Amino acid sequence: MLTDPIADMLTRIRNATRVYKESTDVPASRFKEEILRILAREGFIKGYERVDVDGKPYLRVYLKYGPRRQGPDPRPEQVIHHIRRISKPGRRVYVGVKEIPRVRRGLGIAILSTSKGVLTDREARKLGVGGELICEVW
Amino acid sequence: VKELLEAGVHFGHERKRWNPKFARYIYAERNGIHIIDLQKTMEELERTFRFIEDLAMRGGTILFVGTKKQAQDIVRMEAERAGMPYVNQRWLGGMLTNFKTISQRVHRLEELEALFASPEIEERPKKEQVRLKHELERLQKYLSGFRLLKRLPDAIFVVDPTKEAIAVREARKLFIPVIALADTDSDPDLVDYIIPGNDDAIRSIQLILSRAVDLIIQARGGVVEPSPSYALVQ
Amino acid sequence: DFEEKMILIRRTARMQAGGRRFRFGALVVVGDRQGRVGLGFGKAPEVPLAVQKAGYYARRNMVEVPLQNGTIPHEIEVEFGASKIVLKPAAPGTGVIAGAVPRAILELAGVTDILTKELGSRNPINIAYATMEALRQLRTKADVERLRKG
RNA sequence: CGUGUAGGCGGCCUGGGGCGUCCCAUGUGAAAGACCACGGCUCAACCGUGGGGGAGCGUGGGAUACGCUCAGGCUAGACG
RNA sequence: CCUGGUCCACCCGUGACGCUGAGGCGCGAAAGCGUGGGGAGCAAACCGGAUUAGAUACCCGGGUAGUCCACGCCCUAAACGAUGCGCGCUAGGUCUCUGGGUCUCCUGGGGGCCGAAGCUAACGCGUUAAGCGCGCCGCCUGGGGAGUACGGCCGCAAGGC
Ligand SMILES: [Mg+2]
Ligand SMILES: [Mg+2]
Ligand SMILES: [Mg+2]
Ligand SMILES: [Mg+2]
Ligand SMILES: [Mg+2]
Ligand SMILES: [Mg+2]
Ligand SMILES: [Mg+2]
Ligand SMILES: [Mg+2]
Ligand SMILES: [Mg+2]
Ligand SMILES: [Mg+2]
Ligand SMILES: [Mg+2]
Ligand SMILES: [Mg+2]
Ligand SMILES: [Mg+2]
Ligand SMILES: [Mg+2]
Ligand SMILES: [Mg+2]
Ligand SMILES: [Mg+2]
Ligand SMILES: [Mg+2]
Ligand SMILES: [Mg+2]
Ligand SMILES: [Mg+2]
Ligand SMILES: [Mg+2]
Ligand SMILES: [Mg+2]
Ligand SMILES: [Mg+2]
Ligand SMILES: [Mg+2]
Ligand SMILES: [Mg+2]
Ligand SMILES: [Mg+2]
Ligand SMILES: [Mg+2]
Ligand SMILES: [Mg+2]
Ligand SMILES: [Mg+2]
Ligand SMILES: [Mg+2]
Ligand SMILES: [Mg+2]
Ligand SMILES: [Mg+2]
Ligand SMILES: [Mg+2]
Ligand SMILES: [Mg+2]
Ligand SMILES: [Mg+2]
Ligand SMILES: [Mg+2]
Ligand SMILES: [Mg+2]
Ligand SMILES: [Mg+2]
Ligand SMILES: [Mg+2]
Ligand SMILES: [Mg+2]
Ligand SMILES: [Mg+2]
Ligand SMILES: [Mg+2]
Ligand SMILES: [Mg+2]
C-alpha cells in the first residue's frame, strides 16, 4: 500500500534509469514534484509533466542519460549513479543548519525539507536553516 | 529507387523468437512474422553508409563476415569484388583478438604456396605429399579471404550478428567499429552501424550487401554493373 | 614501461596421479605516476614468467586516474565481491594511508594524499580489482556537469 | 501455521493550531584539564597570562515543508 | 446435506475503515497416552529358521501394542521452497490449470521450465526474486560442553517450552 511514497519515487526512478528508459510515471504528489523540480532545477532529468491514467493522476519523469560508449557493454553512463532516501518513516532524520551533509565532496546534492521550503545541501545552507534530511542524489 | 527495391521482398523476418531491445525497429506482426519498419530502416542505412563512405574514401580496409549458408556465397563475391577481406567459412576464434597468432597460419599458407611450385617436389615421400597437400587444402580452405591486409580492420560488416556475435565480441574488446545487417533475432545495442533487415533470405542480403560494395567503390573510381547475383536465385 | 611493482606472488597447486603439479600467480601494478595505473594478474609455470605476463597483461589494462592537487577528486565506497573499500581524499601533505595493496596501486596512481580502508574480505587479488573499479569510477566537477548539460 | 491485543509504521487534496522539527537572541555551561598563542625557571617536564571552542537545558521572538493534531473533501489502498 | 476460503465480470455502495503483530487464543503428520469400541491385512517387541567368526541385524516362517472409530490428552518433525508477512518497481520466450470478451486474439488468477538488467562466495535466483525499495514481527553472533544442568511453566506419562 506504499508506506513511504517518496522513497518509492526514487526507487521507480532508480530502476527505470538502471535500464535506460524514456520516462517513468510516479503517482501525483505536490511534495513529490518538489523533489522533482529540485531534481531537475539541478539538471538530473530532462524534466517531467502531469498526466492521468484514467482519473489516476501520475507524473511523467523524463530521464537523462549519457553518451553511448566505446567497447564491450556500450551502455551509456547515467546522470544519476546513485539516489537513496535518508529520513525514512521508520526513523525520521533531522539536521541542524551545521549538520547538513556535504554530498559527494560537493559534486553531489542532498534534497531536504525545511520550514521555509524544499532546499538543497547548498541552498538550505545558504538560507542557513535546517529540517528533515529527505535524501541525497549524485 | 531504394524503397521499392526493399519493399520488393527484403524486410520482415524471424517471428516470435525475437529480442525486445530490437523493438525500436519493427512495424507490426503480420500473420505471425515481425514486419520491420523500413521507414526507419532507411534512416539507419544512411548513417551507416555515411560512415562506410566517410571511410571508403580515406584508405580504410573493411572485414566482411557471413558463416551462414543462406548467405555464404554472395559474401564471397562482394568481397573479392572490392578487395575487402572477409570470412565465408568457420570464423576462427581469436582472429582479430589473436591476430598475430592466427596470422602465423596465413604465413604457413604461402610457406606451402611457394613449396607448391618447386623442384623440391622431385623428392619428399608420399606421406608428406599427401600430408602437406592436404594440410594446404584446409589451410587454403579457411583463409581464402583472411589474408589480404596484415593489419586489423578499421571496421567489420556482417550479416546475422548474433549468429557471429563471437566475432563481434572480439571486435568490441579491441575497439573496432561494428557495422552489420541484423534482423529481429538480434540485439542492436552492441552494434554500432545497424542495418535492420532480413538475414536469411538471400534476396535482402544480396541487395544490402551489393549497394554496399558499390558504395565502397564509388569512393575509388570505377562505377560498373552489379555482380553475379542470380545463378539459382529462386 | 612504467613503475611496475608487483602486489603479490603465490604458488597454487593441482592434483594428478603420482603427485601435485604447481603454477605461479603474480599480481602486478604498473603506473607512470601522472594518472595511469594498470593491474595485471599473471599466472604461469614459473615466477619470472608469471611476473612478466602480469606486466604485459597490466599495460594492456590501465586507467586514467583523474588526480587533483595530488589527491582523489571525491570520496568513494566500492563493493567488489566479498571485498569492499573506502577512499577519502586528504588535504595536501597528508600521506597515502592504506594497506599494502590500495597503496602500491595508488602510489603509481599518482596520488600522494588519500585516506582509505579495506572492508569485508581483505584478500589481495579482490581488493586489488576492488581498488581499480574504485578509481575507474571517479569524477571531476567538470565531467560532472559535463553530463548535466541539457 | 493461523487469528489477533498492545505497540510500531500510514493514500490523495484544502484550511486552523504549532507539540516534534528548524532559525535568531539571551541565561547557563565554576575552576582545573583538553586545543591556540605568548611569556617564567638555561630547555623541557612542570607553571603563568590572554584567546577560542562546549554539547545539553531554561526564558523571549519567529518559520510551517515534513512528522503530529483538529476540521472539511476524494477514490488509486481496503471492505461491500 | 452443512460449511470455509479463492477467482472472474459488472463501476453499484462505504470512504483510508490500512500493513504488521510482543503477549494471548486456535490448528497442528507420524509415533505415544487416557475411557470405551473394533480387528482382515500389516507389524516394533517377541520366538523360531537360515547367514556369519558372532548376527541381540539385513532374508524366511510366526506374532502383540499399534495402525481403524468416538471422546479427551500429548504439541514434536528434514512441521523444507531448509526462502516471515504486506505493498511498489524492474525484458521476453515456452506449456499448463482455471475465469471473461465485438474469441488466429485480447485481458485476469495459479502452477512449472528457460532466462533481461541486476544480485550471489559459488552453486544458483531471476515479475512464483535470492533484483531495486519502504513498514512491522521473529531470530543469529566460532566448534565441543548442550538443547545438557538448575529454576520456572505445562503434561497422566513419555516429555515439552
Ligand atoms: Mg592418468
Ligand atoms: Mg575521465
Ligand atoms: Mg564477481
Ligand atoms: Mg557483499
Ligand atoms: Mg572476514
Ligand atoms: Mg495478522
Ligand atoms: Mg496502534
Ligand atoms: Mg513548537
Ligand atoms: Mg532539539
Ligand atoms: Mg553562549
Ligand atoms: Mg573551562
Ligand atoms: Mg621560554
Ligand atoms: Mg586559561
Ligand atoms: Mg550552539
Ligand atoms: Mg480525512
Ligand atoms: Mg463459496
Ligand atoms: Mg463507486
Ligand atoms: Mg460521497
Ligand atoms: Mg498431533
Ligand atoms: Mg497415531
Ligand atoms: Mg507404551
Ligand atoms: Mg504377518
Ligand atoms: Mg516378519
Ligand atoms: Mg543362529
Ligand atoms: Mg562375516
Ligand atoms: Mg480417534
Ligand atoms: Mg493445545
Ligand atoms: Mg528435527
Ligand atoms: Mg520441501
Ligand atoms: Mg503466470
Ligand atoms: Mg503443483
Ligand atoms: Mg547477466
Ligand atoms: Mg533461472
Ligand atoms: Mg509486473
Ligand atoms: Mg515469466
Ligand atoms: Mg540471499
Ligand atoms: Mg512474522
Ligand atoms: Mg567458547
Ligand atoms: Mg561454546
Ligand atoms: Mg525443570
Ligand atoms: Mg506434574
Ligand atoms: Mg499413561
PDB file of N, CA, C and O in Angstrom, chain B residues 49-107:
ATOM      1  N   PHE B  49      26.073   3.884 -44.238  1.00  0.00           N
ATOM      2  CA  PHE B  49      26.873   4.133 -45.427  1.00  0.00           C
ATOM      3  C   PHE B  49      27.671   5.417 -45.275  1.00  0.00           C
ATOM      4  O   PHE B  49      28.811   5.508 -45.735  1.00  0.00           O
ATOM      5  N   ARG B  50      27.066   6.411 -44.631  1.00  0.00           N
ATOM      6  CA  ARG B  50      27.750   7.673 -44.387  1.00  0.00           C
ATOM      7  C   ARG B  50      29.116   7.276 -43.855  1.00  0.00           C
ATOM      8  O   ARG B  50      30.152   7.649 -44.404  1.00  0.00           O
ATOM      9  N   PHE B  51      29.088   6.490 -42.787  1.00  0.00           N
ATOM     10  CA  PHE B  51      30.293   6.001 -42.144  1.00  0.00           C
ATOM     11  C   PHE B  51      31.152   5.251 -43.148  1.00  0.00           C
ATOM     12  O   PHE B  51      32.332   5.552 -43.324  1.00  0.00           O
ATOM     13  N   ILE B  52      30.548   4.266 -43.804  1.00  0.00           N
ATOM     14  CA  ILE B  52      31.263   3.472 -44.795  1.00  0.00           C
ATOM     15  C   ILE B  52      31.975   4.406 -45.768  1.00  0.00           C
ATOM     16  O   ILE B  52      33.195   4.310 -45.964  1.00  0.00           O
ATOM     17  N   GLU B  53      31.195   5.309 -46.362  1.00  0.00           N
ATOM     18  CA  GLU B  53      31.700   6.277 -47.324  1.00  0.00           C
ATOM     19  C   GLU B  53      32.765   7.167 -46.705  1.00  0.00           C
ATOM     20  O   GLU B  53      33.823   7.385 -47.296  1.00  0.00           O
ATOM     21  N   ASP B  54      32.488   7.670 -45.505  1.00  0.00           N
ATOM     22  CA  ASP B  54      33.428   8.541 -44.808  1.00  0.00           C
ATOM     23  C   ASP B  54      34.682   7.753 -44.418  1.00  0.00           C
ATOM     24  O   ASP B  54      35.582   8.273 -43.756  1.00  0.00           O
ATOM     25  N   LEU B  55      34.727   6.493 -44.846  1.00  0.00           N
ATOM     26  CA  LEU B  55      35.851   5.613 -44.562  1.00  0.00           C
ATOM     27  C   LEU B  55      36.405   5.021 -45.849  1.00  0.00           C
ATOM     28  O   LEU B  55      37.615   4.863 -46.011  1.00  0.00           O
ATOM     29  N   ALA B  56      35.511   4.687 -46.767  1.00  0.00           N
ATOM     30  CA  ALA B  56      35.930   4.115 -48.029  1.00  0.00           C
ATOM     31  C   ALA B  56      36.752   5.131 -48.810  1.00  0.00           C
ATOM     32  O   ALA B  56      37.468   4.768 -49.742  1.00  0.00           O
ATOM     33  N   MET B  57      36.659   6.402 -48.423  1.00  0.00           N
ATOM     34  CA  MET B  57      37.399   7.448 -49.119  1.00  0.00           C
ATOM     35  C   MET B  57      38.694   7.835 -48.416  1.00  0.00           C
ATOM     36  O   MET B  57      39.431   8.693 -48.902  1.00  0.00           O
ATOM     37  N   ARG B  58      38.977   7.209 -47.277  1.00  0.00           N
ATOM     38  CA  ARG B  58      40.200   7.522 -46.543  1.00  0.00           C
ATOM     39  C   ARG B  58      41.178   6.351 -46.429  1.00  0.00           C
ATOM     40  O   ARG B  58      41.914   6.239 -45.443  1.00  0.00           O
ATOM     41  N   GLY B  59      41.183   5.492 -47.445  1.00  0.00           N
ATOM     42  CA  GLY B  59      42.086   4.351 -47.468  1.00  0.00           C
ATOM     43  C   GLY B  59      41.952   3.393 -46.302  1.00  0.00           C
ATOM     44  O   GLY B  59      42.952   2.997 -45.697  1.00  0.00           O
ATOM     45  N   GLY B  60      40.716   3.012 -45.994  1.00  0.00           N
ATOM     46  CA  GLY B  60      40.474   2.100 -44.890  1.00  0.00           C
ATOM     47  C   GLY B  60      39.924   0.749 -45.318  1.00  0.00           C
ATOM     48  O   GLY B  60      39.015   0.670 -46.148  1.00  0.00           O
ATOM     49  N   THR B  61      40.476  -0.317 -44.740  1.00  0.00           N
ATOM     50  CA  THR B  61      40.044  -1.675 -45.063  1.00  0.00           C
ATOM     51  C   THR B  61      38.905  -2.149 -44.176  1.00  0.00           C
ATOM     52  O   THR B  61      38.837  -1.825 -42.995  1.00  0.00           O
ATOM     53  N   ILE B  62      38.004  -2.918 -44.764  1.00  0.00           N
ATOM     54  CA  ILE B  62      36.869  -3.436 -44.029  1.00  0.00           C
ATOM     55  C   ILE B  62      36.880  -4.952 -44.092  1.00  0.00           C
ATOM     56  O   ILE B  62      37.370  -5.540 -45.060  1.00  0.00           O
ATOM     57  N   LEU B  63      36.350  -5.582 -43.048  1.00  0.00           N
ATOM     58  CA  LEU B  63      36.292  -7.036 -42.984  1.00  0.00           C
ATOM     59  C   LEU B  63      34.858  -7.527 -42.891  1.00  0.00           C
ATOM     60  O   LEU B  63      34.158  -7.284 -41.909  1.00  0.00           O
ATOM     61  N   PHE B  64      34.436  -8.226 -43.935  1.00  0.00           N
ATOM     62  CA  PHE B  64      33.090  -8.762 -44.016  1.00  0.00           C
ATOM     63  C   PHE B  64      33.050 -10.205 -43.541  1.00  0.00           C
ATOM     64  O   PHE B  64      34.016 -10.950 -43.718  1.00  0.00           O
ATOM     65  N   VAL B  65      31.933 -10.605 -42.940  1.00  0.00           N
ATOM     66  CA  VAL B  65      31.805 -11.979 -42.469  1.00  0.00           C
ATOM     67  C   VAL B  65      30.378 -12.479 -42.558  1.00  0.00           C
ATOM     68  O   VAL B  65      29.427 -11.744 -42.267  1.00  0.00           O
ATOM     69  N   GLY B  66      30.255 -13.742 -42.959  1.00  0.00           N
ATOM     70  CA  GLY B  66      28.967 -14.397 -43.096  1.00  0.00           C
ATOM     71  C   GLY B  66      29.198 -15.896 -43.160  1.00  0.00           C
ATOM     72  O   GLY B  66      29.524 -16.439 -44.217  1.00  0.00           O
ATOM     73  N   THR B  67      29.034 -16.571 -42.027  1.00  0.00           N
ATOM     74  CA  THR B  67      29.255 -18.010 -41.967  1.00  0.00           C
ATOM     75  C   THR B  67      27.992 -18.840 -42.142  1.00  0.00           C
ATOM     76  O   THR B  67      28.007 -20.048 -41.895  1.00  0.00           O
ATOM     77  N   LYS B  68      26.900 -18.201 -42.556  1.00  0.00           N
ATOM     78  CA  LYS B  68      25.654 -18.927 -42.762  1.00  0.00           C
ATOM     79  C   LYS B  68      25.473 -19.249 -44.246  1.00  0.00           C
ATOM     80  O   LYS B  68      25.766 -18.418 -45.109  1.00  0.00           O
ATOM     81  N   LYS B  69      25.002 -20.461 -44.534  1.00  0.00           N
ATOM     82  CA  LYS B  69      24.811 -20.924 -45.908  1.00  0.00           C
ATOM     83  C   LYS B  69      23.855 -20.075 -46.740  1.00  0.00           C
ATOM     84  O   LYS B  69      24.112 -19.806 -47.918  1.00  0.00           O
ATOM     85  N   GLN B  70      22.745 -19.661 -46.142  1.00  0.00           N
ATOM     86  CA  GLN B  70      21.785 -18.847 -46.870  1.00  0.00           C
ATOM     87  C   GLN B  70      22.314 -17.428 -47.017  1.00  0.00           C
ATOM     88  O   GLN B  70      21.543 -16.468 -47.008  1.00  0.00           O
ATOM     89  N   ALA B  71      23.636 -17.310 -47.156  1.00  0.00           N
ATOM     90  CA  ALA B  71      24.309 -16.021 -47.305  1.00  0.00           C
ATOM     91  C   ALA B  71      25.818 -16.169 -47.450  1.00  0.00           C
ATOM     92  O   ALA B  71      26.536 -15.177 -47.437  1.00  0.00           O
ATOM     93  N   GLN B  72      26.307 -17.398 -47.571  1.00  0.00           N
ATOM     94  CA  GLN B  72      27.740 -17.615 -47.731  1.00  0.00           C
ATOM     95  C   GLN B  72      28.203 -16.992 -49.050  1.00  0.00           C
ATOM     96  O   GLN B  72      28.642 -15.836 -49.113  1.00  0.00           O
ATOM     97  N   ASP B  73      28.103 -17.808 -50.095  1.00  0.00           N
ATOM     98  CA  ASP B  73      28.471 -17.470 -51.466  1.00  0.00           C
ATOM     99  C   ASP B  73      28.572 -15.980 -51.790  1.00  0.00           C
ATOM    100  O   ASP B  73      29.658 -15.467 -52.068  1.00  0.00           O
ATOM    101  N   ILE B  74      27.433 -15.296 -51.762  1.00  0.00           N
ATOM    102  CA  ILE B  74      27.391 -13.874 -52.067  1.00  0.00           C
ATOM    103  C   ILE B  74      28.502 -13.114 -51.372  1.00  0.00           C
ATOM    104  O   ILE B  74      29.279 -12.417 -52.018  1.00  0.00           O
ATOM    105  N   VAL B  75      28.580 -13.256 -50.056  1.00  0.00           N
ATOM    106  CA  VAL B  75      29.605 -12.573 -49.279  1.00  0.00           C
ATOM    107  C   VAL B  75      30.980 -12.857 -49.861  1.00  0.00           C
ATOM    108  O   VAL B  75      31.870 -12.007 -49.810  1.00  0.00           O
ATOM    109  N   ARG B  76      31.157 -14.056 -50.411  1.00  0.00           N
ATOM    110  CA  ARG B  76      32.436 -14.406 -51.009  1.00  0.00           C
ATOM    111  C   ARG B  76      32.653 -13.460 -52.185  1.00  0.00           C
ATOM    112  O   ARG B  76      33.753 -12.942 -52.385  1.00  0.00           O
ATOM    113  N   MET B  77      31.585 -13.233 -52.949  1.00  0.00           N
ATOM    114  CA  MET B  77      31.620 -12.349 -54.117  1.00  0.00           C
ATOM    115  C   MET B  77      31.972 -10.917 -53.743  1.00  0.00           C
ATOM    116  O   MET B  77      33.118 -10.500 -53.874  1.00  0.00           O
ATOM    117  N   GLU B  78      30.964 -10.181 -53.287  1.00  0.00           N
ATOM    118  CA  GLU B  78      31.083  -8.785 -52.872  1.00  0.00           C
ATOM    119  C   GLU B  78      32.417  -8.389 -52.230  1.00  0.00           C
ATOM    120  O   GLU B  78      32.776  -7.209 -52.214  1.00  0.00           O
ATOM    121  N   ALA B  79      33.136  -9.369 -51.689  1.00  0.00           N
ATOM    122  CA  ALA B  79      34.420  -9.112 -51.040  1.00  0.00           C
ATOM    123  C   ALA B  79      35.571  -9.037 -52.043  1.00  0.00           C
ATOM    124  O   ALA B  79      36.321  -8.060 -52.075  1.00  0.00           O
ATOM    125  N   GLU B  80      35.710 -10.084 -52.850  1.00  0.00           N
ATOM    126  CA  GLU B  80      36.758 -10.136 -53.858  1.00  0.00           C
ATOM    127  C   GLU B  80      36.506  -9.000 -54.832  1.00  0.00           C
ATOM    128  O   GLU B  80      37.441  -8.396 -55.358  1.00  0.00           O
ATOM    129  N   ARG B  81      35.226  -8.716 -55.059  1.00  0.00           N
ATOM    130  CA  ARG B  81      34.811  -7.646 -55.958  1.00  0.00           C
ATOM    131  C   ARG B  81      34.879  -6.313 -55.205  1.00  0.00           C
ATOM    132  O   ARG B  81      34.006  -5.461 -55.344  1.00  0.00           O
ATOM    133  N   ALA B  82      35.929  -6.148 -54.404  1.00  0.00           N
ATOM    134  CA  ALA B  82      36.129  -4.931 -53.624  1.00  0.00           C
ATOM    135  C   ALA B  82      37.470  -4.977 -52.904  1.00  0.00           C
ATOM    136  O   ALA B  82      37.885  -3.989 -52.295  1.00  0.00           O
ATOM    137  N   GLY B  83      38.135  -6.132 -52.968  1.00  0.00           N
ATOM    138  CA  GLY B  83      39.433  -6.291 -52.327  1.00  0.00           C
ATOM    139  C   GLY B  83      39.394  -6.214 -50.812  1.00  0.00           C
ATOM    140  O   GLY B  83      40.436  -6.130 -50.155  1.00  0.00           O
ATOM    141  N   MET B  84      38.182  -6.244 -50.264  1.00  0.00           N
ATOM    142  CA  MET B  84      37.964  -6.181 -48.823  1.00  0.00           C
ATOM    143  C   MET B  84      38.004  -7.588 -48.238  1.00  0.00           C
ATOM    144  O   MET B  84      37.268  -8.464 -48.687  1.00  0.00           O
ATOM    145  N   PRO B  85      38.867  -7.825 -47.231  1.00  0.00           N
ATOM    146  CA  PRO B  85      38.966  -9.152 -46.612  1.00  0.00           C
ATOM    147  C   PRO B  85      37.585  -9.653 -46.215  1.00  0.00           C
ATOM    148  O   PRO B  85      36.611  -8.891 -46.241  1.00  0.00           O
ATOM    149  N   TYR B  86      37.491 -10.924 -45.832  1.00  0.00           N
ATOM    150  CA  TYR B  86      36.194 -11.486 -45.469  1.00  0.00           C
ATOM    151  C   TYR B  86      36.309 -12.892 -44.907  1.00  0.00           C
ATOM    152  O   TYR B  86      37.376 -13.505 -44.959  1.00  0.00           O
ATOM    153  N   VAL B  87      35.199 -13.398 -44.375  1.00  0.00           N
ATOM    154  CA  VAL B  87      35.150 -14.754 -43.839  1.00  0.00           C
ATOM    155  C   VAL B  87      33.859 -15.445 -44.273  1.00  0.00           C
ATOM    156  O   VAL B  87      32.758 -14.993 -43.945  1.00  0.00           O
ATOM    157  N   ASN B  88      34.014 -16.543 -45.013  1.00  0.00           N
ATOM    158  CA  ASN B  88      32.885 -17.309 -45.515  1.00  0.00           C
ATOM    159  C   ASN B  88      32.798 -18.676 -44.839  1.00  0.00           C
ATOM    160  O   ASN B  88      31.721 -19.259 -44.757  1.00  0.00           O
ATOM    161  N   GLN B  89      33.928 -19.190 -44.361  1.00  0.00           N
ATOM    162  CA  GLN B  89      33.940 -20.486 -43.688  1.00  0.00           C
ATOM    163  C   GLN B  89      33.788 -20.371 -42.161  1.00  0.00           C
ATOM    164  O   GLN B  89      32.996 -19.574 -41.667  1.00  0.00           O
ATOM    165  N   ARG B  90      34.531 -21.183 -41.415  1.00  0.00           N
ATOM    166  CA  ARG B  90      34.458 -21.155 -39.954  1.00  0.00           C
ATOM    167  C   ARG B  90      35.279 -20.006 -39.385  1.00  0.00           C
ATOM    168  O   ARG B  90      36.510 -20.055 -39.381  1.00  0.00           O
ATOM    169  N   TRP B  91      34.591 -18.975 -38.898  1.00  0.00           N
ATOM    170  CA  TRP B  91      35.266 -17.808 -38.332  1.00  0.00           C
ATOM    171  C   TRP B  91      36.080 -18.180 -37.102  1.00  0.00           C
ATOM    172  O   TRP B  91      35.579 -18.082 -35.981  1.00  0.00           O
ATOM    173  N   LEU B  92      37.335 -18.582 -37.310  1.00  0.00           N
ATOM    174  CA  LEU B  92      38.195 -18.976 -36.199  1.00  0.00           C
ATOM    175  C   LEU B  92      38.090 -18.070 -34.968  1.00  0.00           C
ATOM    176  O   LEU B  92      37.775 -16.879 -35.063  1.00  0.00           O
ATOM    177  N   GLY B  93      38.336 -18.657 -33.805  1.00  0.00           N
ATOM    178  CA  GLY B  93      38.243 -17.906 -32.573  1.00  0.00           C
ATOM    179  C   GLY B  93      39.518 -17.190 -32.203  1.00  0.00           C
ATOM    180  O   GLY B  93      40.577 -17.796 -32.091  1.00  0.00           O
ATOM    181  N   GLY B  94      39.415 -15.887 -31.996  1.00  0.00           N
ATOM    182  CA  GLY B  94      40.582 -15.114 -31.643  1.00  0.00           C
ATOM    183  C   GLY B  94      41.261 -14.582 -32.884  1.00  0.00           C
ATOM    184  O   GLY B  94      42.454 -14.291 -32.859  1.00  0.00           O
ATOM    185  N   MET B  95      40.519 -14.467 -33.982  1.00  0.00           N
ATOM    186  CA  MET B  95      41.123 -13.939 -35.200  1.00  0.00           C
ATOM    187  C   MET B  95      41.610 -12.544 -34.841  1.00  0.00           C
ATOM    188  O   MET B  95      42.773 -12.352 -34.489  1.00  0.00           O
ATOM    189  N   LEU B  96      40.700 -11.584 -34.893  1.00  0.00           N
ATOM    190  CA  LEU B  96      41.016 -10.206 -34.563  1.00  0.00           C
ATOM    191  C   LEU B  96      41.739 -10.150 -33.220  1.00  0.00           C
ATOM    192  O   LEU B  96      42.762  -9.485 -33.073  1.00  0.00           O
ATOM    193  N   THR B  97      41.195 -10.872 -32.249  1.00  0.00           N
ATOM    194  CA  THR B  97      41.720 -10.913 -30.885  1.00  0.00           C
ATOM    195  C   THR B  97      43.048 -11.635 -30.699  1.00  0.00           C
ATOM    196  O   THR B  97      43.731 -11.435 -29.699  1.00  0.00           O
ATOM    197  N   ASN B  98      43.414 -12.484 -31.645  1.00  0.00           N
ATOM    198  CA  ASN B  98      44.672 -13.209 -31.537  1.00  0.00           C
ATOM    199  C   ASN B  98      45.265 -13.257 -32.934  1.00  0.00           C
ATOM    200  O   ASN B  98      45.844 -14.262 -33.377  1.00  0.00           O
ATOM    201  N   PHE B  99      45.110 -12.122 -33.605  1.00  0.00           N
ATOM    202  CA  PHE B  99      45.579 -11.919 -34.961  1.00  0.00           C
ATOM    203  C   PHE B  99      47.001 -12.414 -35.151  1.00  0.00           C
ATOM    204  O   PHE B  99      47.244 -13.351 -35.915  1.00  0.00           O
ATOM    205  N   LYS B 100      47.935 -11.783 -34.445  1.00  0.00           N
ATOM    206  CA  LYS B 100      49.343 -12.146 -34.545  1.00  0.00           C
ATOM    207  C   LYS B 100      49.543 -13.649 -34.634  1.00  0.00           C
ATOM    208  O   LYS B 100      50.350 -14.126 -35.440  1.00  0.00           O
ATOM    209  N   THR B 101      48.791 -14.382 -33.815  1.00  0.00           N
ATOM    210  CA  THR B 101      48.898 -15.832 -33.763  1.00  0.00           C
ATOM    211  C   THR B 101      48.156 -16.531 -34.881  1.00  0.00           C
ATOM    212  O   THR B 101      48.599 -17.574 -35.359  1.00  0.00           O
ATOM    213  N   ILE B 102      47.021 -15.974 -35.291  1.00  0.00           N
ATOM    214  CA  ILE B 102      46.270 -16.580 -36.381  1.00  0.00           C
ATOM    215  C   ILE B 102      47.071 -16.330 -37.645  1.00  0.00           C
ATOM    216  O   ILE B 102      47.217 -17.216 -38.489  1.00  0.00           O
ATOM    217  N   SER B 103      47.595 -15.115 -37.768  1.00  0.00           N
ATOM    218  CA  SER B 103      48.400 -14.758 -38.921  1.00  0.00           C
ATOM    219  C   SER B 103      49.403 -15.872 -39.170  1.00  0.00           C
ATOM    220  O   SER B 103      49.542 -16.343 -40.296  1.00  0.00           O
ATOM    221  N   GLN B 104      50.087 -16.294 -38.107  1.00  0.00           N
ATOM    222  CA  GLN B 104      51.087 -17.368 -38.171  1.00  0.00           C
ATOM    223  C   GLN B 104      50.744 -18.458 -39.179  1.00  0.00           C
ATOM    224  O   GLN B 104      51.639 -19.085 -39.750  1.00  0.00           O
ATOM    225  N   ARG B 105      49.449 -18.703 -39.369  1.00  0.00           N
ATOM    226  CA  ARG B 105      48.999 -19.714 -40.312  1.00  0.00           C
ATOM    227  C   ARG B 105      49.006 -19.125 -41.704  1.00  0.00           C
ATOM    228  O   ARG B 105      49.461 -19.764 -42.649  1.00  0.00           O
ATOM    229  N   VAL B 106      48.497 -17.904 -41.826  1.00  0.00           N
ATOM    230  CA  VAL B 106      48.471 -17.226 -43.111  1.00  0.00           C
ATOM    231  C   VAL B 106      49.864 -17.368 -43.703  1.00  0.00           C
ATOM    232  O   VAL B 106      50.018 -17.723 -44.873  1.00  0.00           O
ATOM    233  N   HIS B 107      50.876 -17.101 -42.882  1.00  0.00           N
ATOM    234  CA  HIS B 107      52.263 -17.229 -43.312  1.00  0.00           C
ATOM    235  C   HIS B 107      52.557 -18.673 -43.693  1.00  0.00           C
ATOM    236  O   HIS B 107      53.278 -18.929 -44.652  1.00  0.00           O
TER     237      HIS B 107
END
